[PDB]
């Protein structure tokens, strides 16, 4: 730690000791159902972008590796999460929105976009934490005579709020002459259909879009992954996986006053203090494992190689496993220097009126004194 081969006399803070975890536990709820992504992707027909569907997925085990078999897409477009890490963590509520748009309009299914779909048809929130799946469908959404069943809106008085619908069919009145249903030169119907032919280029072909929305939250989890659980162990430095959060610490029983709706606790530094077990409704504190600082008291390297090691701040019944003589000091536990009843000048300072020195006894050794 000094980047040298010779060490002078004094005290040096070298490193920090830690207690390593022993076991690893996983705590997931008691859910055995399977999430029907099959009914979402394997479907005969989809809905229009102005009347997009929304399927609630809840109380099931979600496997996201079977999505690739249902539809022939290229890759996920995930915001906030990664598509390969969707099985090691889990949410509370998952939705699925299905609609059919054009190939130029796929880029408007991103958060923060402004356009035609992203203003008047389907607006995503700027804090989106989900994935967008889109693939070409030119064999089931196109006809040689014409597939006119897919509709979109060009005219609206205002812009859509995120995650809202408007399926009303009223005649838009852009002009100053009221018509109340007369499609004249100033009134137009704001509902036009795509003229899908198979003989287009790659940009104007229909595309099927499935948008997944995730709700990682302090609510109890209902949609989770295929990972088995582990029996709970207390009063031991372990690694825990309580509903998708990973940490290292000691779990003890609590005398806290958690309300029935509250499921987590937090610290001033915004780290988790208490967590609720999903299987049995009990509260466990998260206390980090034993740590501290290690200081090395040595004389000169030309003098001797005897080393006294001080663990800063702990008592000697808390040490995990240096030297042989064990002394208690208000600065910490000093191991390797015997305590004499005499008093001399301070050679190497330790703290709280305690000094150390390399002196004889009759046989050279390190002593500690007031």
């Amino acid at each position: 730690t000094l980047k040298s081969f010779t060490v002078e006399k004094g005290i040096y803070q070298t490193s920090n000791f830690r207690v390593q975890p022993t076991e690893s536990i996983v705590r997931f709820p008691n859910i055995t159902n399977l999430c029907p992504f099959h009914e979402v992707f394997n479907a005969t027909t989809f809905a229009s972008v102005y009347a997009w569907n929304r399927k609630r997925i809840s109380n099931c085990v979600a496997d996201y590796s079977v999505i690739y078999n249902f539809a022939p897409f290229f890759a996920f477009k995930c915001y906030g999460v990664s598509p390969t890490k969707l099985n090691d963590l889990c949410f509370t509520n998952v939705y699925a929105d299905s609609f059919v748009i054009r190939g130029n309009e796929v880029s408007q299914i991103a958060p923060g976009q402004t356009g035609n779909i992203a203003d008047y048809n389907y607006k995503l929130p700027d804090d989106f934490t989900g994935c967008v799946i889109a693939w070409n469908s030119n064999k089931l959404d196109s006809k040689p005579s014409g597939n006119y069943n897919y509709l979109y809106r060009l005219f609206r008085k205002s812009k859509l709020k995120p995650f809202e619908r408007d399926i009303s069919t009223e005649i838009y009145q852009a002009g100053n002459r009221p018509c109340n249903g007369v499609a004249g030169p100033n009134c137009y119907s704001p509902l036009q259909s795509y003229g899908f032919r198979p003989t287009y280029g790659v940009g104007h072909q229909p595309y099927r879009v499935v948008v997944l929305s995730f709700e990682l939250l302090h609510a109890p989890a209902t949609v989770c992954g295929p990972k088995k659980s582990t029996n709970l162990v207390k009063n031991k430095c372990v690694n825990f996986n309580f509903n998708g959060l990973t940490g290292t610490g000691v779990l003890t029983e609590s005398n806290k006053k958690f309300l029935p709706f509250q499921q987590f606790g937090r610290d001033i530094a915004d780290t988790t203090d208490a967590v609720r077990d999903p299987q049995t409704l009990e509260i466990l504190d998260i206390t980090p494992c034993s740590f501290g600082g290690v200081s090395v008291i040595t004389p000169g390297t030309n003098t001797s190689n005897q080393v006294a090691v001080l663990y800063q701040g702990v008592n000697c019944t808390e040490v995990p496993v240096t030297g042989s003589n064990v002394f208690q000091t208000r600065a910490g536990c000093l191991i390797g220097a015997e305590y004499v009843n005499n008093s001399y000048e301070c050679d190497i300072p330790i703290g709280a009126g305690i000094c150390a020195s390399y002196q004889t006894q009759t046989s050279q050794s390190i002593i500690a004194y007031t």
Binding site: F163, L259, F264, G265
Partner: protein, 214 residues
């Protein structure tokens, strides 16, 4: 109708999240009822226009000891066209409906414990908020007009309904008397005690003294 006006005092405090905090002074920005605001007092007497605009959150309160309030109806319009929420209480269970059938083809149904647990004055408080398609319901039962003090409201009931709400009314089984308060985006300073509940709060945009406190 008998429209009247009353100070709000400090009766618009609710829990902003589901995270336990103890002995921590916390600052939150959410739709809150401002301190010393103006609530509207209504006296519905039937031998009146109960249509009121939503305007981003509604604080509801009633001082009636007897169970004479059955529930509420919401929605933009009530001509059996769009989805309109409906709460029916009969002192045995709660009934929630979404379909456009008004008070005498439904997607979401919800049956749970009734909202009137208690049968003193038994002041009841309700906060209805519609943010991100969720109908958040906050309630608190205070055995004691609006008194002086604090009573935080717990998010015990949530609805994934996802509709548009502009108007709202109440349901009667007339000597009703209820207060209506409106929510505005404000910043508070909530104080948690050792037991983890909210006991004091400071509205940061009321007077310069509370701005100094925040």
């Amino acid at each position: 109708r008998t429209q009247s006006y009353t100070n709000s005092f400090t009766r618009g405090v609710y829990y902003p999240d589901k995270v336990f905090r103890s002995s921590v002074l916390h600052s939150t920005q959410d739709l809150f009822l401002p301190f010393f605001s103006n609530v509207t007092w209504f006296h519905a007497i039937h031998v009146d226009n109960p249509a009121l605009p939503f305007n981003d959150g509604v604080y509801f309160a009633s001082t009636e000891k007897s169970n004479i309030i059955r529930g509420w109806i919401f929605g933009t319009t009530l001509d059996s066209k769009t989805q309109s929420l409906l709460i029916v209480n009969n002192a045995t269970n709660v009934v929630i409906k979404v379909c456009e059938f008004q008070f005498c083809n439904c997607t979401f149904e919800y049956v749970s414990q009734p909202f009137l647990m208690d049968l003193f004055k038994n002041l009841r408080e309700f906060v209805f908020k519609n943010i991100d398609g969720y109908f958040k319901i906050y309630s608190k039962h205070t055995p004691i007009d609006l008194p002086q003090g604090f009573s935080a409201l717990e998010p015990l009931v949530d609805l994934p309904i996802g509709i548009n709400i502009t108007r709202f009314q109440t349901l009667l089984a007339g000597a009703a008397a209820y207060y209506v308060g409106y929510l505005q985006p404000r910043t508070f300073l909530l104080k948690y005690n050792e037991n983890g509940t909210i006991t004091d709060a400071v509205d940061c945009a009321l007077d310069p003294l509370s701005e100094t406190k925040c």
